[PDB]
């Protein structure tokens with residue numbers, strides 16, 4: 059067994075390779091998109107994880123796409139996150155903040171001024187996002203057609219990512235994870251299906267990856283490369299966003315470029331919740347030889363699969379999502395081969411303590 063052995067991850071050292079995947083739970087306070095004491099307790103309960111990767115968090119107000127998702131751009135948000143990271147550290151844990159801009163997977167009612175959300179192009183995501191009703195309960199609503207970002211608006215987006223990372227550092231996070239997957243803003247530019255731009259930010263893979271790489275360079279300069287991680291979902295289709303007709307080649311190009319920056323880790327989301335074709339070992343080898351930092355695998359993983367791939371030297375750690383929702387002490391359970399608590403999907407989004415902090419530890 060190797061899942062329970064130490065691993066150097068950028069600036070910190072994880073005591074095991076069982077990581078907690080980023081999980082949107084939509085329980086933040088509105089107005090303000092402020093993290094809560096309840097959220098602090100939830101993360102504290104899971105502090106034994108090799109590394110906790112937080113729920114997706116807004117780099118700006120414009121970045122918001124879901125009612126209940128937290129931000130890391132205001133003083134109130136920074137103060138609240140400081141208490142949460144302190145709780146995790148009090149229990150000897152490590153926590154990274156996943157930073158995102160939802161782009162077109164949003165709704166005008168939660169955008170600044172109630173205006174249309176932004177994206178690489180003016181194409182509707184054709185999916186749904188989560189808002190809140192008059193009683194504060196989570197509700198699904200069709201996404202609003204976006205406005206294409208103007209060329210001179212791009213530097214502002216890069217700067218928002220830069221500022222958010224500076225804020226993350228002050229908030230006490232150990233690392234930051236750029237959300238460059240699942241059809242959100244960065245992925246919207248990466249994919250030909252959602253990017254029909256004719257300027258230097260669309261067309262060739264070099265142009266499509268231009269934005270995410272400018273962001274990576276900006277955050278490495280703001281803090282340090284060994285504090286930066288990135289999540290990608292380059293193979294298959296995720297929330298209606300595929301990766302084009304040359305996904306494998308384009309993925310390898312992006313990974314080689316990321317490697318040049320010497321960042322802390324590469325987090326690969328292998329499949330959408332609805333499923334997808336499995337990664338071939340040949341592809342895993344091509345990825346492995348192109349990146350020199352930690353590689354995290356994710357997507358319906360079993361402990362057995364994690365051990366198999368870590369033993370073959372193809373990945374270094376595994377991020378579990380739904381199992382972590384239902385098992386705060388997942389590490390101890392997997393180590394002892396104990397049974398897990400059953401999942402209650404109806405409380406994954408919104409609500410309060412029920413289905414959030416009420417899953418017991420052994």
Ligand SMILES: Cc1cc2nc3c(=O)[nH]c(=O)nc-3n(C[C@H](O)[C@H](O)[C@H](O)COP(=O)(O)O)c2cc1C
Nearest residue numbers: 079080081082113114356357358359378379380406
């Ligand atoms: C309730 C819920 C919320 C999620 N929110 C996030 C998130 O904020 N960011 C992210 O990158 N993926 C998110 N995911 C995907 C998970 O990180 C993970 O990749 C996925 O659940 C597959 O892993 P699993 O089979 O171990 O759960 C979410 C999934 C679920 C079920």
Ligand SMILES: O=[N+]([O-])c1ccc(O)c([N+](=O)[O-])c1
Nearest residue numbers: 082114124239240296297331
């Ligand atoms: O539904 N969600 O709130 C949500 C948020 C971010 C994500 O990255 C995902 N996803 O791709 O699994 C889902």
